Amino acid sequence: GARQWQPDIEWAEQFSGAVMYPSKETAHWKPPPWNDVDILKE
Amino acid sequence: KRFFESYHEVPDGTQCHRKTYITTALGGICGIIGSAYSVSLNPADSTLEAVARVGRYTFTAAAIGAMFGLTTCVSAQVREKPDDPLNYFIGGCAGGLTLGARTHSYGTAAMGCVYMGTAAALFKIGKLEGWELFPTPKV
Amino acid sequence: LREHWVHILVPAGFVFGCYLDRKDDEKLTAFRNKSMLFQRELRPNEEVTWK
Amino acid sequence: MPSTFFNLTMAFSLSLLGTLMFRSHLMSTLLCLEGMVLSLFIMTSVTSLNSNSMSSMPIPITILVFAACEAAVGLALLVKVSNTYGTDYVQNLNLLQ
Amino acid sequence: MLKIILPSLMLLPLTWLSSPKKTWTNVTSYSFLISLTSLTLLWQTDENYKNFSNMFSSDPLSTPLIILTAWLLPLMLMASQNHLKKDNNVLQKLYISMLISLQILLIMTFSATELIMFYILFEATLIPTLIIITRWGNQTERLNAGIYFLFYTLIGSIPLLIALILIQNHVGTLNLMILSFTTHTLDASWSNNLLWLACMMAFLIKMPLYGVHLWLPKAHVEAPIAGSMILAAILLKLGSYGMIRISIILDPLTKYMAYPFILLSLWGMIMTSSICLRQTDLKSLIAYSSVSHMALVIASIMIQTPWSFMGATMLMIAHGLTSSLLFCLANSNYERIHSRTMIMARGLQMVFPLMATWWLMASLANLALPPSINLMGELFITMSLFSWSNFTIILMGINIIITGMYSMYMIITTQRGKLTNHMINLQPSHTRELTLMALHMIPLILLTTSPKLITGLTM
Amino acid sequence: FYVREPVNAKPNWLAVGLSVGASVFMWIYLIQTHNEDVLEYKRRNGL
Amino acid sequence: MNPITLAIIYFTIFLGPVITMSSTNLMLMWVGLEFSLLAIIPMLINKKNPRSTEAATKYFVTQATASMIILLAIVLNYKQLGTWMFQQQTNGLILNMTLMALSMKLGLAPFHFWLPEVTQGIPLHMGLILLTWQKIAPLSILIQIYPLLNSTIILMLAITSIFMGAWGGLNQTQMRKIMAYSSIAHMGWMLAILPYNPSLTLLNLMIYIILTAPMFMALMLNNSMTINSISLLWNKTPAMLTMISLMLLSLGGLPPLTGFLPKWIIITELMKNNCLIMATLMAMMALLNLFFYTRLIYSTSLTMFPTNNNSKMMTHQTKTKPNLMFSTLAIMSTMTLPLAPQLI
Amino acid sequence: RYGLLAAILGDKTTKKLHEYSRVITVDGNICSGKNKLAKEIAQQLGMKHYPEAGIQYSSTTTGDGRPLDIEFSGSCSLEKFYDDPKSNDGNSYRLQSWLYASRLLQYADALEHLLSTGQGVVLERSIYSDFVFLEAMYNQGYIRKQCVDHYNEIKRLTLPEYLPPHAVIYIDVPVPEVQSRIQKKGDPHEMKVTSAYLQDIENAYKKTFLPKMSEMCEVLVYDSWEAEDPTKVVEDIEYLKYNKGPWLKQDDWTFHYLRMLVQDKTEVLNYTTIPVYLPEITIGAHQGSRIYNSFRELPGRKYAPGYNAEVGDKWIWLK
Amino acid sequence: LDLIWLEKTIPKSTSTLHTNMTTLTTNQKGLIKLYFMSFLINIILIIILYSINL
Amino acid sequence: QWQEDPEPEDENVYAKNPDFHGYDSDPVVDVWNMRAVFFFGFSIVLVFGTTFVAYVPDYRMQEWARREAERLVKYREVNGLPIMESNYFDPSKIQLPEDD
Ligand SMILES: CCCCCCCCCCCCCCCCCC(=O)OC[C@H](COP(=O)(O)OCCN)OC(=O)CCCCCCCCCCCCCCCCC
Ligand SMILES: Nc1ncnc2c1ncn2[C@@H]1O[C@H](COP(=O)(O)OP(=O)(O)O)[C@@H](O)[C@H]1O
C-alpha cells in the first residue's frame, strides 16, 4: 500500500533550463537545442 | 612591498595609524582587482557606469580594510593584550559588518561577521604559530 | 553438492577464515616464546610453546 | 642587440595586448596573432645570428612553417564563420553561453 | 577476526545466487549463526586486548559492539521483509546486500587497529546507508534527508582526514596500539586547540551534538525501518567509538577544550528531551530521544573518568538495542496505520495485546527503570558528571524528569485510551513483528543479568 | 526465433578459440615465469 | 571523412602529444603542442553545426596565443642560456610564462573559460579527446620542468581551479559542461602537487582518465547531454545505472572507491611538505564537487524521473552495446582502492 | 556489423545501386487504395514493399515478431482515436507520436535495406507525410498547440538526418468519395470520422506536403483513375528522371555514415525520446517501471537476442 | 531554536552562501572579448605576483 | 495529465493463508521462514550463546584478582607489610630531577 514517492513532472522540471539556479537575467537563458544545431538564419 | 610587510613588524595594537593605512590599501587593491574582473566580465553599459562600479567596489573594499585594521588595532589597545586571535576576530567581525552595510543587508553582515572574522583570527593564529602558506618544496 | 551449493557458501567462508586467522599466527610468530612474562624453557618433546 | 631585443619583445607584448583585447572583426586578431610570429621569428633569427649558432637556424624557419599552417587553420575557421553568419564579428560567437 | 568478516562477505554471494523465494531465509538464518561466531570474541580470560592480526583487533570497547553489529543484520533483514516484499526480486537482493555490507564495514570499523582504516571504513558506511535511506525512502523529502546525512558527516570527515595524516607525520604511525604506548602530548597551543577540534568534530557530528543534530531527526523520519535501526543502533555509536580511541592522543587539551561541548550537550540534553514532549511524529520523538540519550554520552567521553567511559559503553550498547526496539515497533504501527502521526492509533492494547507489552518494556528501557543496564549506564555518567561539578545534577536532573514524561506519553497516547474508531482495520500481529521485538529485548534482559561484558575499556 | 535474427545465435567460434586459447597461453607463461623466477631468486641470492 | 583524412588527422592528434613527450629540445616540444592544435580543430567541426564553428574558433584562438607565449619562453631562454631548454639558471619570469601559457592550453583557473564552452559544442566523443588526450601533452611539459617552476603560482592556479570548477559545476545542468567543469577541478589537484611530487600528478591524471573515459562513453551510450536525458537511463539501459552511480561518486573524493587515493595521497604529500593551509581549503571545496555529482546521482539512480512513451519503442530495439573498455575501465576505476600501495 | 573496416574493404553502397533503386513513398487520404498501388509498384521493380507503419510494427520488427500487448506498445489505439476524439488521456497524440516513431523505424529499416541489398524502397506514407494527420488534428480540437510543438521538435531533430524520398506519389480521391469508401469497408471506428477532419488531412497535403516535396523529390500526382492502374503509374515512375534532390551528393564515403546510423535503431529514434515532459507522452515512473519490468520479462526479451534460452537459444555459455 | 535558528544558521546558510557565489561566477555573457580580457587581467596580476615577491 | 498507476491497495494477507506468519505470501515459504528463524534466532543463539558466554572463565581476570588479593592480603598482613603501600613504583627506581 506504499509508494515511495517517485519524482513527479514538477520535480523534474527544475533540472531543465540552461542553468540550475537561475539568476534574474540568467533566467532568460534557454536550454540549448537537443540536436546541437540552432535555428538562426538570414 | 617593504611597505605592506611593515604591518607585521611593529607589535600589534601599536601604531594603529600605519595598520589602518596598510589594511585599507590592501582592501582597496583587492577592490580594484575585483572591480576589474567584475567589469571585464559582466561588463557595464556605459563607461561611467563601470567607473562607478570600480569606485563602489574599491571603496567598499577599502572600508572593510580600514575597519578591520582599526578595530583589531584598537581592540588590542583597549584590551591591552597584543597577541590574541580575539582581537582580530573583533576586527574581522567589524569588517564584515561594513561589507554588510555597503551591501545594505543585515544577513550578509551575519555571515560576513562570522566568516570574515574567523578568517582574520586564523591569520593571527597563523602568524603566532608560524604557519607557512604557499611553502617551497622541502619534502 | 547439488542444489546445496548455495548453502555451503557461507559455511565455507568460515573455514577459509579460520584458515587465515591461524595463518596470521604463523607469520606473527617472532617472540614465539621469547616474551618475558611467558618465557618458559621448552618441555621435553614439545616443539614450540604456542602454535 | 640588447637594446633592440627589447623593442622586439615589447612588439610581441604590444601584439599580445592586441590579441587579448578583441574588437569586432576576427581577421584583425588572426592578423595580430601573426604579428607575434614575426616578432618571434625576428628575435630567434637575431640571437642565433649573433651567437653564430648555425646549428639552430633550422628553428627560425620551423617556427614559420608551423605558424603558417597554424594560420591556415585559423583562416579556414574564419571563412567558416562568415559563411554561417557572413559578418565575421567576434560579436556573434556567443551561442555557447 | 575474519570469521566474523569473511563468512559475512560470503553472505553477499548467497543473497545473489540463492532462489528468489528462498533468498530471505538463507540470509537471515546464516547471519544468526554469523552472530554465534561473533560471540567467540567475548572469551577474554585476561586483560590483554586480543590483537587478531596486524590490521584487525578487538578490545573490550569494540567487542561489545561487533556482536551487536552482527546481531542486528539478522534483525534488520527480518524487519524489512514486509516493505521490500513488494519489490522486483532484484531490488530485494540489493537491499539485503546493502544491509549485509553495513555490518561487514561496521564490524571492520569497530574492529580496526589503524585509525585511518577507521576513517576509510568509517566514511564508507555512508554509501550503504544513503542508498538505503534515499532509494527506498517513502517520503518526498528523503533526497533532502540524504543530502543532510552526507554533507554533515562529509564536512566533518575531511578535517579528521587532515588531522590523522597530520599525527602520522608528527608521531609516525596511526596504529592505535602504538599511539597509546607512545608519548603524544599536545602542547595547548592555539593550533593544537584546533587539532583537537578537527579530530573530535567528525565523531561529534555523527554522534548528534546539540549544535549539529538536525541531520538525525530528518534522516530517521523518511529512512526505511532497516536504515533507522542501523542509524540509531550502530551508525551513531561509530562516532562514540571514534571518540574513545582518538582521545588517547590529544590527552592534555580535552581537560580545558571540552567545556564548550559538555555544556552544549547537557543543555542540549534538556532541550532535545523536551521537544520530544510535543512532537506529533512518533519516529520524530524516538529520534530526539536518541539525540538526548546520546548527548549524555558525549558528556562522558569528555569528562573522561573511568566510570564515565563504561557508563558510556553500557548506555551505548543498551540504548542501541532499546532505540531499535522503539523504531521497530513504531514501524509496525506505521505499516497498519499508514501514517507516522502519534495522535491517530489510540488504544492499540485493546487490539494488539502483546505488542503493547513490548511497547511497555521498551519504554521502561527508554526511561531508567533500575534492574536494566540502561539505568546503570545513566547512573554512572550521572555520578561522574556530578564529580566534574556538583551542579551538573540540576541539568542531568531536568533530563531525567522529562525523559520519564515523553517515554510514558509514547505509551499513553499510542498504546492506551479509547480505540481509534475505524482506521483501516488493523490486521493482527505477524509473528515476525513480534519476534523482531523479542529478539531485541531478550538480549536486553540477558545482558542486564551480567553487565560486566559491556562495561568498557576502563573497567 | 526472431524476425530479425540475432547476430550472435551460433557462437563466433574464433572468439572462443582466441579467448580460450589466449588465456591458456597466459597461464603457461605465468606459471612458467613464477617457478623460473623462484629459481633465479634462489640462485641469485643464497638459495 | 575520407578514411585517409581520418588517418592523417588521427595520426597527428596522436603524434602530437607523443612528440612532446619524447623530445627534450623544447622546440620539438612546442611543435608537438602545435600539431595537437592543428589536428583537433578538424574533428571539432565534424557536424559543422553553427555551435561547432564557434567552438573551434574559440579553442583555436585560445590555443594559438598560448602556443605563441610558450614559443616566446623558448625564444627568451635561447638568449639567456644558449640552450634550447629550461635550466636551473632560467629567469623566473621565463618559467612563469610557461606556466601561464601551459595553464591556458590545459585550461586551469583564471583561463578556465574556453574549456567549458568548447566542451559544450563538440560531440561527446571528441569531448573525451579534448579533455583527456590533449591534457597529456601540456602536462608532460610541465612535469618535465617541475623542479624549476614556482610553488606559489601553481598553488594559486590550483586552488582557483578547484573553486572555479566546483562553483561552475553546481549551476550547470548540461552534462558536457558538468564534465568540463570537473576536469578543471581535477586538473587543479594535479597541478598542485607538481612542484612537490610530480609522480603523483601522473596518478591523479590516470585515475581521472580511467574515471572520465568510462563516464563519457556512458553519457553517449544514450547520447544524453542533459541530466534529464541521463535520468531516463533506468528505462533506456538499467545496468549502467549502478556503475554510473559509483563512478561519479568516485570522481568526487568519497573513501571506499578508487577516487579517494589521488586526493588522499596529494593531501599526504602536501602535509609532508607542510602546506596544511592550502591542502585543507582544497579538500573542503573538493566536497562541493561531490554535491553536484550526487545531485546527478539523485536524478539518474536514487530517484526515477518520469519518461516519455516513445522510450518503450527504443527498449524494444536491441541496444547497441557499450564497448568492453567501459567495463574494464569502470571496475579498475570504481574499486582498485584495495590496491593503492602499488599504484603510488 | 557494418563498420569502417567493411567500408575500407569493399562493401560500398555505390556499387550496389541501380536505376530501380530508389525510395518511393505513396501517400493518400485515410483511404486511397494506396496499399495496392505500393504492392503493385513493388511487384513491378521487385521493390521491397514496406507495409504502413503500425502500433506493433516495432514489435513485429524486433525479436519474436508476435504482436505486443497494447501497454507494451505504448498504449495507443487508432480505434479509440476515432470513438473518443479530444480524449482526457490524449490517446490520440500518444497514437500519433508512436506512429511517427514507427515510421522512423520503418524508414530507417528501409534505408538499411536500400544501402545494403540495393533493392529500392516503397513504404507508403512517410515521416515527411505524417505531419498532415497532426495538422488536421490541431485544426480541430484533437490536439492542443504545444502538443503540435512537441511533434515538430521531434520531427526537426530526427527527420533531416535521413535522405529525402526519391519520388513521392499522390493517390488523391475527393473528401466525399473516401468517406463512402470508408462507409463500405467494415470497421465501425473508421466510420463516423469528421468530413471536415478528412478535409483538413488532404488540404494539408495539397497546401504543404506536395509543394514542399516538389523540389526535394519527384512528386507524381495521380488521380484515382490513374490509380487502380498500377501499370500506368509504374510506367510513369520508370519515366521520371531522378535528378533534382539532395540525393545527388551521396558519395560512398557519405553513405557509409548514413548506413551506420540506420544500422543502429537505438539512435534512429534517440531524439524520439527527448526528455520534453508534455503530459500525454510521459510514461510516469511507477507505471513505466512496471511496464518495462514487464516487457523485459517476455520470453527472449530478458536478455539480448541470441542469449535468452526460453525461445530456444543455445551456446550461451560460450557466446 | 530548533527548526529556524539552528537550521538557518548552519545548514541553510551554507546552502545560500554557495548558491549565491555560483550565481555570480557562472553568469557569463559567453562573448569571447570579455573572457579574454580576464586573461589579460590574470597575466597582469601574475606578472606582479612574481615582481613584488621578486 | 501524465499517465501513472492508480494507488495499489495493501492486501489482507491474513484473508488467504489464515496462518500467515508475516514472512512471505505463499504458505510453505512462511512456515519454513519461521521454523528456521525462531530456531536459529532463539533456539541456538539466545541459548547456546548465553551458555557459552556464561561459561567464559574469569572474564578480564576479575576471578583471578579476588584470589591474588587474598594471598597478597594473606601474605602482607601476616608479614606485617602495609596492605597497599602508598607508592607503587619504588622511590629508589625513580631519578627525580635533582635540582628542582
Ligand atoms: C564499500 C561499500 C561500498 C558500497 C557498496 C554497496 C552499494 C553498491 C553500489 C550501489 C549503487 C546503486 C544504488 C542504486 C541501484 C539501483 C539499481 C536498480 O534500480 O535496479 C536495476 C539494476 C539493473 O537491472 P538488471 O540487473 O538489468 O535487471 C533488473 C531490471 N529491473 O539492478 C542492478 O543494478 C543489480 C546489480 C546492482 C549491483 C549489485 C551490488 C551489490 C552490493 C555491492 C556491495 C559491495 C560491498 C563491499 C564491501 C567491502 C568491504 C571491504
Ligand atoms: N498519423 C496518423 N494519425 C492517425 N491515424 C493514422 C495516422 N497514420 C495512419 N493512420 C491511419 O491509417 C488509416 C489508413 O490506412 P489504410 O489506407 O486503411 O491502409 P491500407 O493502405 O492497407 O489501405 C487511416 O484510417 C488512419 O487513421
Identify residues of A whose CB sits under 8 angstroms from chain H CBs: 3, 6-7, 9, 12-13, 16, 34-35
The answer to whether G102 touches G142, Cβ cutoff 8 Å, is: yes
Q: How far apart are CA B102 and CA C9, in angstroms?
A: 69
Instruction: Count CA atoms closer than 13 A to F38's CA, side-chain side.
Output: 5
Nearest to E132 by CA among E239, E226, E8, E218: E226
Contact status of D62 with chain G (Cβ, < 8 Å): yes
Number of domains in chain D: 1
Pocket test for ligand 2, best of H52, H127, H190, H197 (most atoms within 8 A of CB): H52
- Distance (Å, rounded) from C-alpha G108 to C-alpha G93? 19
Closest atom of ligand 2 relative to the H124 alpha carbon = 21
Please indicate whether residue E302, judged by its CB atom, sits closer than 6 Å to ligand 1: no
Residues contacting E380, CB < 8 A, separation 6+: E300, E307, E308, E310, E311, E314
> Going by CA atoms, what residue is nearest to atom 17 of ligand 2?
H31
Residues of D in contact with A32 (CB under 8 A): 95
**Chains H and J are in contact, defined as 3 or more C-beta pairs closer than 8 angstroms:** yes
- Quick one: which of H193, H203, H195, H233 has its CA closest to H26? H233
Helix (H) or strand (E) holding G167: helix G151-171
Q: Tell me the three cell numbers of residue G51.
A: 555551435
Q: Nearest ligand to the C-alpha of residue G337?
A: 1
**CB proximity A14 to I under 8 Å:** no
Give yes or no for a contact between E210 and E288, defined as CB atoms under 8 angstroms apart. no
Residues 6+ apart with CB under 8 A from E305: E384, E387, E388
Q: Nearest 5°: phi and psi at D25?
A: -45, 135
Query: Considering CB atoms only, which of G47, G123, G228 is closest to A15?
Result: G228
Give the bridge partners for G308, in sequence order: H282
Q: How far apart are CA H191 and CA G160, in angstroms?
A: 70
> Strand ranges (DSSP E) for H11-111?
23-28, 48-49
Quick check: CB of G241 below 6 Å from ligand 1?
yes
Cα–Cα nearest to E312, from E376, E231, E234: E376
How many other C-beta atoms are found inside a 10 Å radius of the C-beta of residue B49? 11
State the SS3 of G69-121: HHHHHHHHHHHHCCCCCCCCCCCHHHHHHHHHHHHHHCCCHHHCCHHHHHHHH
Among E83, E140, E142, select the one facing A2 at the smallest CB separation. E83
Across the interface, whether the CB atoms of B33 and I45 are under 8 A apart is answered yes
Q: Between the CA of residue G245 and those of A5, G124, G251, G296, what are the distances in Å?
A: 20, 19, 10, 9
Q: Which three cell numbers mark J44?
A: 541456538
Q: Decide if G236 contacts G312 (C-beta within 8 A).
A: no
Residue E159 CA to ligand 1 center (angstroms) comes to 30
Q: Measure CB to CB from residue H157 to each of A3, A7, A34 and give the nearest one.
A: A34
Q: How far is CA E357 from CA E193, E441, G45, I11, J59, in A?
A: 50, 11, 74, 40, 34
Query: What single letter denotes the amino acid at residue H48?
Result: K
On chain E, the residues whose CB falls within 8 A of the CB of B129 are 189-191
Taking the centre of ligand 2 as the mean of its atom positions, its distance from the CA of residue H271, in whole angstroms, is: 24
Closest residue of chain E to J25, computed from CA coordinates = E85
Task: Compare all CA atoms of chain H with the CA of G226 and give the residue at the minimum distance.
Answer: H275
CATH number of the domain where residue D7 is located: 1.10.287.3510
Please tell me the total number of residues recorded for chain G in this structure. 344
C-alpha cell at I54: 621578486
Query: Minimal Cα–Cα distance from J18 to chain H, Å?
Result: 29
Q: Ligand 1 pocket test: pick from E14, E84, E101 the residue with the most ligand atoms within 8 Å of its Cβ.
A: E101
Method: cryo-EM
Contact state of E169 with G271 under an 8 Å Cβ cutoff: yes
Instruction: Give residues with Cβ within 8 angstroms of I9, minimum separation 6.
Output: none
**Closest by CA position to B23, among listed B88, B68, B89, B58:** B68
**Helices H / strands E in chain C, number of each:** 1, 0
> What is the side-by-side strand order in the sheet with H23-28?
H48-49, H121-122, H23-28, H167-172, H218-223
Q: DSSP secondary structure string, H160-211?
A: GGSPPPSEEEEEE--HHHHHHHHHHSS-TTTTT--HHHHHHHHHHIIIIIHH
DSSP three-state, residue D89: strand
Helix (H, G, I), strand (E, B) or coil at A37: coil
CB spacing of B134 vs G273 below 8 angstroms: no
For residue D20, give the 3-state DSSP assignment: coil
> Residue E454 sits in which domain range?
2-459
> Is residue H219 helix, strand or coil?
strand
Scored b (16 or more CB within 10 A) or e, E140-156 reads eebbbbbbbbbbbbbbb
Cα radius of gyration (chain G): 20
Q: Tell me how crowded residue G323 is: count the other CB atoms within 10 A of its CB.
A: 11
3-state secondary structure chain E: CCCCCHHHHCHHHHHHHCCCCCHHHHHHHHHHHHHHHHHHHHCCCCCCCECCCCCCCECCCCHHHHHHHHHHHHHHHHHCCCCCCCCCCCCHHHHHHHHHHHHHHHHHHHCCCEHHHHHHHHHHCHHHHHHHHHHHCCCCCHHHHHHHHHHHHHHHHHHHHHHHHHHHHHHCCCEHHHHHCCCCCCCCCCCHHHHHHHHHHHHHHHCCCCCCCCHHHHHHHHCCHHHHHHHHHHHHHHHHHHHHHHCCCCCCCHHHHCHHHHHHHHHHHHHHHHHHHCCCEHHHHHHHHHHHHHHCHHHCCCCCCHHHHHHHHHHHHHHHHHHHHHHHHHHHHHHHHCCCECCCCCCHHHCCHHHHHHHHHHHHHHCCCCCCHHHHHHHHHHHHHHHHCCCHHHHHHHHHHHHHHHHHHHHHHHCCCCCCCCCCCCCCCCHHHHHHHHHHHHHHHHHHHCHHHHCCCCC
Ligand of minimum distance to the alpha carbon of G297: 1
Q: In this structure, are strands H167-172 and H218-223 parallel, antiparallel, or unpaired? A: parallel
Cβ(G278)–Cβ(G272) below 8 Å: no
Q: Do H1 and F2 touch (CB under 8 A)?
A: no
Cβ distance G64 to D33 less than 8 Å, yes or no, reads yes
CB of A34 within 8 Å of a chain G CB? The answer is yes
Give residue D93's domain range. 2-97
For residue J25, give Cα distances in angstroms to E21, E25, E427, E442, J39.
10, 14, 15, 28, 21
CB contact under 8 A, D21 and I31: no
Q: How many domains does chain E have?
A: 1
Question: Which ligand is nearest to the Cα of residue H31, counting in written order?
Answer: 2
CB-CB neighbours of E396 under 10 Å: 20
Cα–Cα distance for residue pair G78/C26, rounded to 1 Å: 64
Q: How many CB atoms lie within 10 A of CB E170?
A: 10
**In this structure, which amino acid lies at residue D69?**
C
Q: Do chains H and B touch (3 or more CB pairs under 8 A)?
A: no
DSSP string, F1-47: --SS--SSSS--HHHHHHHHHHHHHHHHHHHHHHHHHHHHHHHHS--
From the CA of G239, give the closest atom in ligand 1. Answer: 23
For the beta carbon of residue J52, count every other beta carbon within 10 angstroms.
14
Q: In chain B, which residues are followed by a C-to-N distance beyond 2.5 Å, i.e. a gap?
A: none
